[PDB]
Amino acid sequence: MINIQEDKLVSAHDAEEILRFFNCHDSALQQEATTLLTQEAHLLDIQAYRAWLEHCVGSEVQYQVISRELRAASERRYKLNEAMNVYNENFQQLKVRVEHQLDPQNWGNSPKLRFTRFITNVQAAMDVNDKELLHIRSNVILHRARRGNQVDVFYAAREDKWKRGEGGVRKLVQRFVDYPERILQTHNLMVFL
Amino acid sequence: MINIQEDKLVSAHDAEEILRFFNCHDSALQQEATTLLTQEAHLLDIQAYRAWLEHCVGSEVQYQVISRELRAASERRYKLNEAMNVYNENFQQLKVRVEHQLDPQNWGNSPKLRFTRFITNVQAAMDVNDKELLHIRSNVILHRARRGNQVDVFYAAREDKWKRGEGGVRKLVQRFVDYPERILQTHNLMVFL
Amino acid sequence: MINIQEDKLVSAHDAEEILRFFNCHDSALQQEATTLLTQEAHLLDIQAYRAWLEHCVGSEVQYQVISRELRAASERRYKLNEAMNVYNENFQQLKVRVEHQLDPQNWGNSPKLRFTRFITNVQAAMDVNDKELLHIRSNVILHRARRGNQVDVFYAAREDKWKRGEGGVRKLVQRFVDYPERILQTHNLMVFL
Amino acid sequence: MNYNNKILVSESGLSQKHLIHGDEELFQHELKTIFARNWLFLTHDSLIPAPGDYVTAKMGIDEVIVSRQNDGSIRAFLNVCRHRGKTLVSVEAGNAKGFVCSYHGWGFGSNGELQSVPFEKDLYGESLNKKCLGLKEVARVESFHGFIYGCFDQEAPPLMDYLGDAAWYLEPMFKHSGGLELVGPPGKVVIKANWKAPAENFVGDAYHVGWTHASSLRSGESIFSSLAGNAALPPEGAGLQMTSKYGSGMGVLWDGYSGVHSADLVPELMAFGGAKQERLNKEIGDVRARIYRSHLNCTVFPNNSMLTCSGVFKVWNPIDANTTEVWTYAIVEKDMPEDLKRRLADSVQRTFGPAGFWESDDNDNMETASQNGKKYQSRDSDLLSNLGFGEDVYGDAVYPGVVGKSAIGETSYRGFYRAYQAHVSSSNWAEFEHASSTWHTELTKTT
Amino acid sequence: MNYNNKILVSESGLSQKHLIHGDEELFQHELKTIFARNWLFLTHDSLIPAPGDYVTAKMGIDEVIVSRQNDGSIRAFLNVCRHRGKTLVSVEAGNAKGFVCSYHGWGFGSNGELQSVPFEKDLYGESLNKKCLGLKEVARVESFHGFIYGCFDQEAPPLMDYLGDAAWYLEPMFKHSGGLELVGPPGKVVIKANWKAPAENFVGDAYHVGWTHASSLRSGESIFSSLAGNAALPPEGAGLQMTSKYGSGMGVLWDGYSGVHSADLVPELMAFGGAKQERLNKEIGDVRARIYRSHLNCTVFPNNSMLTCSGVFKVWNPIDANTTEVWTYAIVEKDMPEDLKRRLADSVQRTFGPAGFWESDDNDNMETASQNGKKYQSRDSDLLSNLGFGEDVYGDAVYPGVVGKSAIGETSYRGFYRAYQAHVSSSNWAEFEHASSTWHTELTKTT
Amino acid sequence: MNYNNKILVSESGLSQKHLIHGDEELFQHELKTIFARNWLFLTHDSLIPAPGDYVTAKMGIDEVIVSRQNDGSIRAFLNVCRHRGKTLVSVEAGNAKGFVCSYHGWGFGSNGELQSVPFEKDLYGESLNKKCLGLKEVARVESFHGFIYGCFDQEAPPLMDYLGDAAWYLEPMFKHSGGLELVGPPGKVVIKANWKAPAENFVGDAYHVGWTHASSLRSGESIFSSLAGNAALPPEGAGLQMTSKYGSGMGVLWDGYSGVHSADLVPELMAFGGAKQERLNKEIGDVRARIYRSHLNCTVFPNNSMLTCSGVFKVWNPIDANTTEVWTYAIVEKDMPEDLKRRLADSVQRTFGPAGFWESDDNDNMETASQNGKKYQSRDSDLLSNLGFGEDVYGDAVYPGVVGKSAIGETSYRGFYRAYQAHVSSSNWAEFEHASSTWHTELTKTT
Ligand code: FES
Ligand code: FES
Ligand code: FES
Ligand SMILES: [Fe+3]
Ligand SMILES: [Fe+3]
Ligand SMILES: [Fe+3]
C-alpha cells in the first residue's frame, strides 16, 4: 500500500510490517492477541516474573530492545553499527535477570517497586509460511514508581512473534523494540517492555 | 497458576486476583465491561458528575483509594496501619463531593477544568457465588489540565465489582485502587479514578 | 440522559455527543472503528503521510484543532471569539503540510523524529440521517521524541466523522479536537492528532 | 541581602515583604536560622511504641531516622552513611536493631553506633576508630504528651518553654483528655507553595473560612455550615486568638468539637466531647474544660500545624521557596472507641488529606500567593496583617499570652512573624532572646 | 557582573556576547532595566471594547489586569490582591464591574479601588484606610491606533516618541488603512529560547528566510516561493531596513501584501491591497501608499513583533533566560470583508501559530542559539551583526531613521542592540538619553 | 567560596567535604578548573576511520564535532555557528566534507574553515574576513593507542605524560594486545548523580563489589560469583591499587579476564586471554603479560572510566551537580573473532548498559550520595577515604606509581582527590604543577 519512493520518511521495514496487517481482516485473532497481551502485562505488573517466564515466554525467545544512533536523514556513506542492544536476550539470559530481580539482596527492590502497564493499538496476523506463527503489534506505556517520589514513564511500539508450543499455550518467541528516546531520562531502562 | 513461595515479589492478594481472570475465557463479558468503563470515563471526562452517580454508581458502593506506607521487603515485625485512605466513600460521601464540585462558589472550578481519561487492559470475570456480581479490572491514565499551564497525570490499576441492580443497569459496587506513587507530585489527588 | 440544568458543569455540546453513543448498542461497528483508528495511528507513527492522506482522509475533510480561551464559569456578557484554530484544514491544506514534512530541506526532520500513538476509549455510532456517515469518538496520547533528549506528550479527545466514499474505504471527513491544555509546554503543536 | 538590617517584617508584625514567600536566598538562610535552630515535629509514640521501631522524617530538607531505643527513649540520626554519604534507610517505617548501608556494608545500630565494618580486621586492621564514626545525631529530642519533636541546636529552650503561652491552650486536649494518638501512615503531597503560606493560614486565619471554604461548608453540613459564602458572621464572643514569644499561636472557636466533620459524625462527636467536658469541669475548671472541646487552629512554630477536634495534623516540609511537601495525619483521643477512631481518621483525610475537598479550596490561595512573591513588581510589596491591631492584650487574668478577644483577626500572624524576623536577623539563640525582650509590648503597642 | 562597565554589545552594535541569551543574572537585571522601564504590549481596543471588558496580560514576568473603564479609558493593574498577595483573576478575558479575591473576599472595582471588605465594620471598624489599598497600578498606558501598551516607569517617553522613526513606516497600515483590529484569542506556546532570539529575528532577519524556511516556501506557494533554498536572490531595490533611537526597527520588502499566505489567499489579498493603495496615493503619496501594501517585519522594542500584510502579531513573554511564552494573534484591516477576515486569521495561525509550519522552521534556530549561550566555551564568544555596516544612512530625504537601502542586512539588529546596551548600563531614563545622544552617528560610523 | 583557601580535600586526600557532590557554584568552578583544563575522552579511531567521518561528543557541558581530516589527522570544533550561535550539527555521527548551518546557510568545512556564505558578493562584498571566522577549535587533540582525547588548554601536558604512572598498567591491553577497538554506538542514560560519584567508584572501589553487586554476582555466575554478599574475602595478593600525579588510577584484580561476564562467555574468554598471555610472556615479561589478562577498574582523570577485560567503557558527562549523562561503549580486542566481538559487546551492555543489571545495583548509591551533598546538615560533613592509608608505597621496583599492595583499599580515591584539590585551587597548569611537587610524598606520608 506504501510506495517508499514517494512516502520519503518511511523505512522499508516499516512498510513491510504495515502490509502484513492491512490484509489480516480477522476479528477473532485480534481478540486472542488482546487477551494474550493483557494477561502478560498483568503478570508483569504484579512482578510475577517466574510466572511470566513459564506461561508467556517461549524457550526459543529473542527478547530485543535497541537504541539507534541519530544519523542524518540524507546519510548514505557512514555504515558503522547503527544501533546497540539495550536488551538482546535468550531464555537463559532472561532467567538470570529474573533471578537478579527475585534475589533478597537486590537492595534496589526494597521498598517494593510499583509497575502499571497500558497496552493499546493491538494488531494481529498469522505468518504466511509458518501457520503456527502469529505476528502481534502493540504499543506500551509503562509506568514505574519507587521510593516516594521517583517516577519514570516509558513509551514504545512492540513487534512480536508468538507461537503455540506445548500445552497449546501461545508463547512469545520474539519481541523487537526500537526505543524511541535516544537518551533515556529515566535513570535506567531496567524494565520488561 | 502462581506459587508465591517461588515468585517472591508477588503478594497473596495479587495472586488471588490473577487466578480469577485466567479462567473466565469469555469474550462477550469482556466487551460488555469495555463498554461500561468507556461510558463511565466519558461521563466523568465531561464532568457530568450527577449522571455518573445516577447511571454508574450503586447505592451500596465502596469507592476506595489507598496510599500504602513504604516498608522493607523483608519487614515482618512492624504491624501498625500499612495504609491510609485517600478516598473511602459510600454513596452519600460521593454525593457530598459531587455537590462540592457543582457549587457555584467552588472557586477552583473557574475557569473550567479539562479532563481526559484513557482506560486500557480491561479484564472481566463473573464472581463464583453471586452470579449477579461482575469483577472488572482495568488501568487508567487520567490527565487534568487547568489554568493555562497546570498539568497533572495520574496512573493506576482499578479493581472493580459491578452488579446489575435495577433497570438491569450494571452499576459500580466497589472500586479499589492502591495508588502507585507514594508522594503525589500533582498538587492533590482530587479526581475520580 | 443528562439534564444540564442539574449537571451544571456540562456543556450542551458534550451532552449532545454522549446521547449519540448510549444508544448505539452495536458491537461490530465498535470493532470496525477500532480497526480504522489503529490503522490510521500506525500509518501516522511510521510517518507514511502520503499513505495516510490517500487511505484515511476524505476529499471533503475538515481537520480542526482549537485552543479555547479561559473564561469565567459564570461568564455571560463577554462574547468575542472564544477560540482560535491551531488547525482548521481542508484536504489541500493538509497536502501542503504533508509536502512540508516530506521536503528534503525540512531541517527539523533530521535526524528522523520518533512518534508513538496510543488510541483508547473508542466509541462508534451511525448518524441518524446520513446512513453512510459514522461518528467515532476516541482519545489519543501522542508521544514525540527527537534530538536525543526532547520529549513531548500530547493528550486529547477526538470527535470524528467517517464516511465510505469510494473503494468502499471508510475515510475521515471531520476531526474535531478541543485541545485541553491552554498554554502548550511542548515547543509547538506540529503533530497530527 | 543583609539579614541583620533588612526589614522583612515591620514593627509589631504588621506587614511582611511579599518576597519572603519567593526568595531562594532567604529560603537558604531559613535552613540555617529557622530549621536548624527551632523545634520540628518528628513523630508520635503511637507510631514507634516498641523497641527497634523507627520512622524516617524530615527536619528542614534533612532526613533523619527516629528510633525507639531499648531503654524506652528515642534518639534521632541523620539518614546518611558516615563512610561515603549514601542514604542509609529507604523506607518510611519498620522495626530493626540496626541499619546496614547497601553501598559497602557498614552496619549501624539503632543507637547510631558504628557496630560492624565488613572484613574490618583484614582491611582496616586496628586503624578505624569506630567510636568516632557513629551516625550524626540530632542534639535535642523532646516530647509533648507523646508528640516527639527534634532540634539540631543544643542551645534551644526546652520544648515546653518553647511552646510558651500556647501550651496552656493545648493541655486540655493533649494532656487532660487522657491522651492523644497519631493515626498513620500520613498522606504525602507536594504543593507549589512556600512552607510559610499554609503555616500562617493555620496559625491565625479564621477570616478565610467563610469565603475560601464556602463550597465545602455548604456541601458537608459540618457545624460551621452557616458561615458559607460569608452568609453569617459568628456571634460576639465566638472565640479568640492567641500568640506567644517563640512564635506558636492559635485561633479558638468556642465549642466546635465536631469541627470540619460532616453531619455523619457530628452527633457522636458532640456527645463524646460533651461527656468528657462534664468530667473535666471538676478537674481543670470550666474554662479549661471548654477549651478541650473547642476547635483550635494552631501552628507550632515554625512548620507544624493542627486543628484539634477536627483532628487534622500537618507538617509543611520545605523543599524550596515555592515547593512544600505536605504530610497529613489524623489525631484521635485514645479513649475513643475504635470504630469512631477509624471513621475520624478517614474523615480527616476526606476533608484535609491528599484528596481532601476542604484542603483543595486552599491550594490556589497558597500557591499563587507564594508564586507572586517571585514576581518583579511584587517582591517589595507589603502583605498586611493589621486586623485587630491595637486591641490585643497581654497578661490577662484568664487567657494567657498575647490575646485578641475575638474569633477573627490577625493576632497570630503578628506573633508568628515577630518570631520569624527575630530569628532571621539573629545568629543564635542568645541574640533571639535579646531581640525578644519586649515581645509582648511590641505586639500590644497601641493597646 | 558590573553592568555599568561590561561591554555586552560592541560599538555600533556590531557584535553581542553570546551569554546575553543564557545568563540568568542578566535576565534578572533585564526585568529591572528592560521590562520595568520600557513600553510593553497589553492588548487591542477590539479585544476590550465595552465598559467592564478585561483581559489579563504579561508585562515581563508580572501579570496585569487590563480593563476598560466606564469613561472609555483603559487602566491596568497588578493581578495581585493587596491583602495577602493571592492572584486576583484566574481567567484570560471577560466582563465585570469588579474583582473579588477568593482567599478572604476583598472586593476590588474595575478601577482598582478597594470597594468592599467582608464585615469591615465588625472587624476593622474604622481602622482600614481603603483609599490607600487599591490595586498596584501600571503608571503609563497609551495607545497607538488601537494597540495598547503599558509601562511601569513614569519617566518614559510618550509611546509615539518611543516609536521614533519606526512610526512613519507603520502609519500607512496602522493609521491610513482605516484601522487595524486584533483577532483573538491568541495562540500560546512555550519555547526553550531567550526572548531576544525571536525579537532579533523578527526585527531584521530577512537573510534567514530563503534558507530556514526553504521547505515552507516551496510547500505553500506564497509570493516569496522563489527564494526557497536560496535559489534566487531578491532583486536590487527589493526593499530596505530601518532602525531607531529607542530600539524599534523593521525590514521592508516592497509590494509583498499577500506575505506568507498560501496561493489560496494571494489573488484576493493582492487585489484588496492594490485597490487601497490606489486610493491612498492621493492621500499620503505614492511612497507611503506603497509602504502600506509592503511587507514589514518589525519589532517594537523590546519584545513585541509583527509581520504586516502577513498579519502576524507576536508577544515574546519572558520566563527565564532559556524560556519564552509566545503569544500569537492575527491582525486584520477593519474594512476587509468578514469572510476574508476569518480566513486571514486562520492562515496566520496556520503559518505562524502553535502548529504553524513556518514558525516550526525557526524553533531549533532559536532554542539552540539561546541554549548555547549557557555553554562554558561559548559564553564569551561574539555573535555577529556586521552585515551592511558602513552603508547605513541617517536623515534621508525620503526614508527616515537609520536606514540600509537593501532588503537583506543587519541594520535593525544593530539599532536593537544599541538600545539594549544603553538600557542595561543605565539606571534610569535620563541616563539612557545621555547614553544615546549620538545614537545615529554611532550606527552610521563608517558611512 | 574562596577556592584558593577552602579545604575541600584534606591532606593526603583522606577526606572530602560532602558538598563537592552537590554544590552548583563548585560545579560552575569545575567547568573552568577541571573540564576546560584537563584531557577528556572524545572518540575512537574505529568510530571515525575514514576521511569526513565525524561524531559529536561532549567536553564538559560543551558540545564538539570530532572529524577525520583528509590528511588522516583528527580535528575537533565547537558545535556552534560563528554567525548567530546556532548548533551546527544535530546528529551523533555521519560522513561529510562540511557542515551547513540551517539558520542562514553559512558553510563550514570539515577543517572548520568558513568556506561559503550565501550571496557573499552581493551582501558582504569584500568586507567579510572568512579566515577569522572558522569554527572555534579545540586546542589539543591526542591519541592513546586509538583512543582520542581532547583538551581546551594549550598549556596541558601531552596525553602520555598526563596518564603518568597509570600508562604502564594500561599498555599491555591497550598496546601489546595488538590493539583495542570501541564498539558503538554508545548507550546514553541520564542519572541524578554528580559526575564524581561514578568516577570515584570506578577509580578505586573494589570494596563495594561484594555487597552492592551481591545479587548480580549470585545471578550471573561470573568469575567473581563467590564474593556475593561478602561471603568470601579475596585471597592475600588477589590484586593491587595504584594512583598517579595527574589523578588517574585503577584497581587491579589478578587474572580476572572474563570479568563481569556470565558463565556463557567465561570459557571462551579465559581461553582467549590465556593464549595471548603465553605469547606476551616473551615480549613484555610475565608480570606485564599477566596485567594484560587482569581486570583493571580505572578512571582516566577526570570523567572517563573503564573495566578492562569486562570491556566496559564509560563517559560521565556533567550536566549539573546532581545530573550526569552516562555514555557506555564496549571495548574489544581487534584480533578477537567477530562473533566473540558481537557477544562481548552485547554482554557489556547487558551488565553495564542502560538496562545493565549490574549498573542498576549502583544507581541509588550514586544518586543519594550525590543528593545528600545538598542537604544542610551534610554539606560540611567529611566523606572518608582512609582505608589502607599508611601502607602505600612509591617507586617500587616492579609496580610504578603510588601503590597499595592489596586488592581492596582507598589508594586511588586519595590520588584522584589530591589532583582534584590541586586543580580547583589552581588558576592554571603551572600552579597545579607547583601544588603537586611533593604529590607522592603526600600520598605515602605515614609509610
Ligand atoms: S557509603 Fe555506606 S558503607 Fe560506604
Ligand atoms: S489575599 Fe485577597 S482577600 Fe486576603
Ligand atoms: S547562525 Fe549559522 S548561518 Fe547564521
Ligand atoms: Fe483553608
Ligand atoms: Fe523565520
Ligand atoms: Fe558497582
Short mmCIF file of N, CA and C in Angstrom, two decimals, chain D residues 14-16 18 21 197 200-201 205 207-209 211-212 230-233 362 364-366 368-370 372-379 381-389 408-410 413 417, chain E residues 27-29 31-33 35-37 58-59 61-63 78-88 100-106 117-120 122-125 127-129 133 136 152-153:
data_model
loop_
_atom_site.label_atom_id
_atom_site.label_comp_id
_atom_site.label_asym_id
_atom_site.label_seq_id
_atom_site.Cartn_x
_atom_site.Cartn_y
_atom_site.Cartn_z
N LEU D 14 3.15 43.95 61.72
CA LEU D 14 2.02 44.49 60.94
C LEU D 14 2.01 44.12 59.45
N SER D 15 3.20 43.98 58.87
CA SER D 15 3.33 43.67 57.45
C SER D 15 4.59 42.82 57.18
N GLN D 16 4.57 42.06 56.08
CA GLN D 16 5.76 41.30 55.64
C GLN D 16 6.02 41.56 54.15
N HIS D 18 6.51 40.66 50.49
CA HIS D 18 5.99 39.54 49.71
C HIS D 18 7.12 38.57 49.28
N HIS D 21 7.99 34.79 50.56
CA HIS D 21 7.36 33.58 50.06
C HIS D 21 7.99 33.10 48.76
N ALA D 197 3.16 29.72 53.84
CA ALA D 197 1.79 30.03 53.42
C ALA D 197 0.77 29.21 54.19
N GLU D 200 1.04 30.05 58.09
CA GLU D 200 0.37 31.28 58.52
C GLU D 200 -1.16 31.11 58.47
N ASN D 201 -1.65 30.33 57.51
CA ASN D 201 -3.08 30.13 57.33
C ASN D 201 -3.65 29.36 58.51
N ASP D 205 -5.81 32.15 60.67
CA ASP D 205 -6.69 32.59 59.61
C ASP D 205 -8.09 31.98 59.63
N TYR D 207 -10.56 34.13 59.13
CA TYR D 207 -11.18 35.08 58.21
C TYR D 207 -11.46 34.46 56.84
N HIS D 208 -10.60 33.55 56.39
CA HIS D 208 -10.76 32.96 55.06
C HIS D 208 -11.80 31.85 55.03
N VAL D 209 -12.16 31.32 56.19
CA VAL D 209 -13.01 30.12 56.24
C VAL D 209 -14.32 30.30 55.50
N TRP D 211 -15.25 32.28 53.23
CA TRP D 211 -15.19 32.54 51.80
C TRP D 211 -14.43 31.49 51.00
N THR D 212 -13.21 31.15 51.41
CA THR D 212 -12.43 30.13 50.71
C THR D 212 -13.15 28.79 50.69
N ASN D 230 -19.78 33.62 53.55
CA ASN D 230 -19.81 34.73 54.50
C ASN D 230 -21.27 35.16 54.69
N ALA D 231 -22.16 34.18 54.72
CA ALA D 231 -23.59 34.44 54.84
C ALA D 231 -23.93 34.98 56.23
N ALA D 232 -23.19 34.52 57.23
CA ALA D 232 -23.38 34.96 58.60
C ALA D 232 -22.03 35.23 59.24
N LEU D 233 -21.98 36.22 60.13
CA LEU D 233 -20.77 36.50 60.90
C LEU D 233 -20.94 35.80 62.25
N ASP D 362 -7.97 25.52 49.41
CA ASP D 362 -6.82 26.35 49.78
C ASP D 362 -5.65 26.39 48.79
N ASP D 364 -4.98 27.02 45.52
CA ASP D 364 -4.66 28.18 44.69
C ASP D 364 -4.27 29.36 45.55
N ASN D 365 -4.95 29.53 46.68
CA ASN D 365 -4.59 30.61 47.58
C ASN D 365 -3.11 30.52 47.95
N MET D 366 -2.67 29.34 48.35
CA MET D 366 -1.31 29.17 48.83
C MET D 366 -0.28 29.28 47.72
N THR D 368 -0.48 30.64 44.55
CA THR D 368 -0.30 31.95 43.86
C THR D 368 0.27 33.02 44.79
N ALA D 369 -0.18 33.05 46.03
CA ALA D 369 0.37 33.99 46.97
C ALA D 369 1.88 33.76 47.10
N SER D 370 2.29 32.50 47.06
CA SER D 370 3.71 32.19 47.16
C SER D 370 4.41 32.57 45.88
N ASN D 372 3.57 34.63 43.59
CA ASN D 372 3.58 36.06 43.30
C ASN D 372 4.75 36.74 43.99
N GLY D 373 5.27 36.10 45.04
CA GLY D 373 6.41 36.61 45.77
C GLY D 373 7.69 36.65 44.95
N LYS D 374 7.72 35.95 43.82
CA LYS D 374 8.88 35.98 42.93
C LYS D 374 8.73 37.04 41.83
N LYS D 375 7.50 37.49 41.58
CA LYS D 375 7.23 38.44 40.51
C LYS D 375 7.88 39.82 40.81
N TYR D 376 8.60 40.36 39.82
CA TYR D 376 9.35 41.61 39.98
C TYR D 376 8.60 42.74 40.68
N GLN D 377 7.41 43.08 40.19
CA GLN D 377 6.69 44.23 40.77
C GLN D 377 6.10 43.96 42.17
N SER D 378 6.14 42.71 42.61
CA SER D 378 5.53 42.33 43.88
C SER D 378 6.51 42.00 45.00
N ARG D 379 7.78 41.82 44.68
CA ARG D 379 8.77 41.41 45.68
C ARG D 379 8.84 42.36 46.87
N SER D 381 6.43 44.48 47.73
CA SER D 381 5.12 44.88 48.24
C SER D 381 4.93 44.35 49.66
N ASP D 382 4.00 44.96 50.38
CA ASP D 382 3.72 44.59 51.77
C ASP D 382 2.46 43.74 51.95
N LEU D 383 2.63 42.54 52.47
CA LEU D 383 1.50 41.70 52.86
C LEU D 383 0.99 42.26 54.20
N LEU D 384 -0.33 42.39 54.35
CA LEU D 384 -0.92 43.03 55.52
C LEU D 384 -1.41 42.06 56.58
N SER D 385 -1.07 42.33 57.83
CA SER D 385 -1.59 41.53 58.94
C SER D 385 -1.93 42.46 60.13
N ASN D 386 -2.74 43.48 59.84
CA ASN D 386 -3.07 44.52 60.80
C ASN D 386 -4.46 44.44 61.41
N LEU D 387 -5.23 43.45 60.99
CA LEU D 387 -6.58 43.26 61.52
C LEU D 387 -6.59 42.96 63.02
N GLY D 388 -7.24 43.83 63.79
CA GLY D 388 -7.36 43.69 65.23
C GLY D 388 -6.17 44.31 65.96
N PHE D 389 -5.28 44.97 65.22
CA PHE D 389 -4.12 45.56 65.87
C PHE D 389 -4.60 46.70 66.75
N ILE D 408 -12.12 36.34 64.91
CA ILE D 408 -11.48 36.63 63.64
C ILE D 408 -10.59 37.86 63.74
N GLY D 409 -9.31 37.67 63.41
CA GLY D 409 -8.32 38.73 63.47
C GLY D 409 -6.95 38.24 63.02
N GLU D 410 -5.94 39.07 63.15
CA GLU D 410 -4.62 38.68 62.65
C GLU D 410 -3.54 38.65 63.76
N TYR D 413 -0.83 35.94 63.28
CA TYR D 413 0.10 36.23 62.20
C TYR D 413 1.22 37.08 62.80
N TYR D 417 5.09 36.19 62.76
CA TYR D 417 6.11 36.94 62.01
C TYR D 417 7.09 37.71 62.87
N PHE E 27 19.29 38.14 32.93
CA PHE E 27 17.84 38.06 32.80
C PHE E 27 17.20 38.84 33.94
N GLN E 28 17.66 38.60 35.17
CA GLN E 28 17.10 39.28 36.36
C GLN E 28 17.28 40.80 36.24
N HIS E 29 18.46 41.22 35.79
CA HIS E 29 18.78 42.62 35.55
C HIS E 29 17.93 43.23 34.42
N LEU E 31 14.81 42.37 33.88
CA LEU E 31 13.48 42.60 34.45
C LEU E 31 13.41 44.06 34.87
N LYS E 32 14.48 44.55 35.51
CA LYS E 32 14.58 45.92 36.00
C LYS E 32 14.82 46.95 34.90
N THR E 33 15.85 46.73 34.08
CA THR E 33 16.28 47.75 33.11
C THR E 33 15.69 47.68 31.70
N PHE E 35 12.34 45.45 31.02
CA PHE E 35 10.89 45.27 31.17
C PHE E 35 10.15 46.25 32.09
N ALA E 36 10.79 46.69 33.17
CA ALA E 36 10.17 47.68 34.07
C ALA E 36 10.30 49.12 33.57
N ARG E 37 11.13 49.34 32.55
CA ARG E 37 11.44 50.69 32.06
C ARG E 37 10.82 51.04 30.71
N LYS E 58 0.74 39.68 30.32
CA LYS E 58 2.02 39.72 30.98
C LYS E 58 2.76 41.02 30.63
N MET E 59 3.55 41.51 31.57
CA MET E 59 4.41 42.65 31.43
C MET E 59 5.67 42.14 32.09
N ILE E 61 7.62 39.34 33.69
CA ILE E 61 7.08 38.17 34.38
C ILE E 61 5.89 38.55 35.27
N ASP E 62 5.56 39.83 35.32
CA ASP E 62 4.43 40.28 36.09
C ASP E 62 3.15 40.05 35.30
N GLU E 63 2.05 39.81 36.00
CA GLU E 63 0.78 39.67 35.32
C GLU E 63 -0.11 40.85 35.71
N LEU E 78 -1.76 45.38 38.67
CA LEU E 78 -1.10 44.14 39.04
C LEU E 78 -2.19 43.15 39.44
N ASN E 79 -2.10 41.93 38.95
CA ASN E 79 -3.11 40.92 39.23
C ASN E 79 -2.82 40.27 40.57
N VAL E 80 -2.77 41.09 41.60
CA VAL E 80 -2.35 40.65 42.92
C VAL E 80 -3.17 41.32 44.02
N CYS E 81 -3.78 40.52 44.90
CA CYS E 81 -4.57 41.09 46.00
C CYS E 81 -3.68 41.86 46.99
N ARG E 82 -4.14 43.04 47.40
CA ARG E 82 -3.43 43.91 48.35
C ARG E 82 -3.38 43.41 49.80
N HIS E 83 -4.17 42.39 50.15
CA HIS E 83 -4.14 41.82 51.49
C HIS E 83 -2.97 40.83 51.66
N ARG E 84 -3.15 39.56 51.27
CA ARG E 84 -2.07 38.57 51.39
C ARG E 84 -1.46 38.09 50.04
N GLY E 85 -1.70 38.82 48.95
CA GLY E 85 -0.95 38.59 47.72
C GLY E 85 -1.35 37.46 46.77
N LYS E 86 -2.56 36.95 46.95
CA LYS E 86 -3.11 35.94 46.06
C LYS E 86 -3.33 36.57 44.68
N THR E 87 -3.35 35.73 43.65
CA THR E 87 -3.61 36.17 42.29
C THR E 87 -5.10 36.43 42.22
N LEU E 88 -5.47 37.61 41.76
CA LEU E 88 -6.86 38.03 41.81
C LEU E 88 -7.76 37.39 40.74
N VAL E 100 -13.35 40.04 42.87
CA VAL E 100 -13.35 39.60 44.24
C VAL E 100 -12.29 38.53 44.47
N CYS E 101 -11.48 38.71 45.51
CA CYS E 101 -10.44 37.74 45.85
C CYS E 101 -11.04 36.53 46.55
N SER E 102 -10.73 35.34 46.05
CA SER E 102 -11.31 34.14 46.59
C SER E 102 -10.65 33.65 47.90
N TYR E 103 -9.61 34.35 48.37
CA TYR E 103 -8.97 33.99 49.64
C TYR E 103 -9.80 34.50 50.83
N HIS E 104 -9.88 35.82 51.02
CA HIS E 104 -10.69 36.39 52.11
C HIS E 104 -11.85 37.28 51.62
N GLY E 105 -12.14 37.32 50.33
CA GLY E 105 -13.31 38.07 49.87
C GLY E 105 -13.22 39.57 49.63
N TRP E 106 -12.03 40.17 49.68
CA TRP E 106 -11.89 41.60 49.40
C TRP E 106 -12.39 41.85 47.99
N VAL E 117 -14.88 45.10 51.95
CA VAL E 117 -14.12 44.17 52.73
C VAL E 117 -15.14 43.48 53.64
N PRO E 118 -15.25 42.16 53.55
CA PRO E 118 -16.28 41.43 54.30
C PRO E 118 -16.29 41.74 55.79
N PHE E 119 -17.43 42.26 56.24
CA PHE E 119 -17.67 42.54 57.65
C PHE E 119 -16.65 43.50 58.16
N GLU E 120 -16.45 44.51 57.33
CA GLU E 120 -15.49 45.56 57.58
C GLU E 120 -15.79 46.28 58.90
N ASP E 122 -17.51 45.33 61.62
CA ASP E 122 -17.30 44.49 62.80
C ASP E 122 -15.82 44.10 63.05
N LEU E 123 -15.00 44.03 62.00
CA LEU E 123 -13.62 43.55 62.13
C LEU E 123 -12.57 44.65 62.15
N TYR E 124 -12.67 45.55 61.18
CA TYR E 124 -11.72 46.65 61.07
C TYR E 124 -12.25 47.92 61.70
N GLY E 125 -13.55 47.97 61.95
CA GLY E 125 -14.17 49.17 62.48
C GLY E 125 -13.97 50.28 61.47
N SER E 127 -10.56 51.48 61.21
CA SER E 127 -9.10 51.47 61.10
C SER E 127 -8.54 51.32 59.68
N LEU E 128 -9.28 50.63 58.82
CA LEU E 128 -8.81 50.32 57.46
C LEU E 128 -8.95 51.50 56.48
N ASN E 129 -7.80 52.03 56.05
CA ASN E 129 -7.74 53.11 55.05
C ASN E 129 -7.78 52.54 53.61
N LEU E 133 -5.42 51.30 49.68
CA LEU E 133 -5.33 49.87 49.44
C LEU E 133 -5.91 49.44 48.10
N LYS E 136 -2.13 47.82 42.89
CA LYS E 136 -0.95 48.50 42.37
C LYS E 136 -1.20 48.76 40.89
N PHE E 152 5.65 50.54 33.26
CA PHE E 152 5.74 50.71 34.71
C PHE E 152 6.49 51.98 35.12
N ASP E 153 7.25 52.58 34.21
CA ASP E 153 8.09 53.73 34.53
C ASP E 153 7.44 55.03 34.07
#
